[PDB]
């Protein structure tokens, strides 16, 4: 059995996470199991770096007016 955090998101973000898995942008292959077109299984010990990467992607194409 596998222990971790299930991630539910839009298909676009699922494809982005799948790309991050193979691109080794985090240093390892921690995106292990893909179960659904909108759900993936991720190890829980580094859920913060995925949050940082997603936030960077989100505010990269945002142009904050500040």
């Amino acid at each position: 059995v596998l222990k971790g955090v299930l991630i539910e998101c839009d298909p676009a973000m699922k494809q982005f996470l799948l790309y991050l898995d193979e691109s080794n942008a985090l240093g390892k292959k921690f995106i292990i199991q893909d179960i659904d077109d909108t759900h993936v299984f991720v190890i829980a010990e580094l859920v913060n770096v995925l949050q940082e990467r997603v936030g960077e992607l989100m505010d990269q194409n945002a142009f904050s007016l500040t």
Binding site: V1, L2, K3, G4, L6, C9, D10, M13, A44
Partner: peptide
């Protein structure tokens, strides 16, 4: 945007 649910697969 990301929903997290710890569990066993």
């Amino acid at each position: 945007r990301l929903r997290f649910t710890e569990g066993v697969l």
